[PDB]
């Protein structure tokens, strides 16, 4: 018997992104080589199998800094972090390989699938 | 030049709700008279003008317990909290007045609007 507000989920994500831009209640720093990215643990877990495993680990859940594998490209991470908070993926010919390798590491199957399709079409 | 994954926002909300059910990374207890509700501060702020004001206040942002006005009905709050995490509002004839008064207090304009329309149509 429920009614549903169609735009609710996108509005929530819009506000979580505004919180991220203003640095409100961000509780983790993701270190990708020389770069730091402030984020909300719950949004990372809700989007990534890797962060879901990290932040449900009884020891890692309490860490304020998570260092990613040095093989991870910071631009690739940046694009995936923007995707997490906006549903929009800035996929380009110059970044697709780094985006795909980063999505595989972060466990983001939908991004991996779209990257594979854009690669196969070119091819 | 971005591409968009249509279901991303609803999937994120689905996962935030699964985190809430399992009590993962919940960081605030909302006390509504005799009842307690565990939630994520960021989801509350992203959905409610009242929680947005509370959790951006330099002192209240650090509180782990927020007590609501004793006039607030716990079932009404419960229904709005489920709406926040699911986009579905369990609106019924027996709960509509409490739901509407709670949405006005929490500052959730879209819920207030739909409640007003269901009231006007009846009557």
């Amino acid at each position: 018997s429920c009614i549903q507000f169609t735009r609710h989920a996108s509005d929530v994500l819009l506000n979580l992104n505004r919180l991220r831009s203003r640095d409100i209640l961000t509780d983790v720093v993701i270190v990708v080589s020389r770069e730091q990215f402030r984020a909300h643990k719950t949004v990372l877990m809700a989007c990534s199998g890797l962060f879901y495993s990290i932040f449900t680990d009884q020891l890692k859940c309490n860490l304020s800094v998570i260092n990613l594998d040095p093989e991870i490209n910071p631009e690739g991470f940046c694009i995936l972090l923007d995707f997490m908070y906006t549903s929009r993926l800035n996929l380009r010919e110059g970044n697709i390989m780094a985006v795909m390798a980063t999505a595989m590491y972060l466990q983001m199957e939908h991004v991996v699938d779209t990257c594979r399709k854009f690669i196969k079409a070119s091819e | 030049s971005c591409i968009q994954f249509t279901r991303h926002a609803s999937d994120v909300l689905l996962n935030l709700n699964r985190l809430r059910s399992r009590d993962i990374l919940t960081d605030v207890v909302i006390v509504v008279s005799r009842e307690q509700f565990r939630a994520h501060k960021t989801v509350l702020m992203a959905c409610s003008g009242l929680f947005y004001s509370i959790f951006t206040d330099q002192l209240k942002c650090n509180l782990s317990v927020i007590n609501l006005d004793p006039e607030i009905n716990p079932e009404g709050f419960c229904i709005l909290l489920d709406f926040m995490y699911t986009s579905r509002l369990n609106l019924r004839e027996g709960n509509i007045m409490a739901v509407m008064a709670t949405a006005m207090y929490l500052q959730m304009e879209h819920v207030v609007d739909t409640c007003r329309k269901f009231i006007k149509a009846s009557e």
Binding site: C2, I3, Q4, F5, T6, R7 | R88, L89, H110
Partner: peptide, 5 residues
């Protein structure tokens, strides 16, 4: 907006 889901 509101719809029947």
């Amino acid at each position: 907006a509101w719809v029947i889901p």
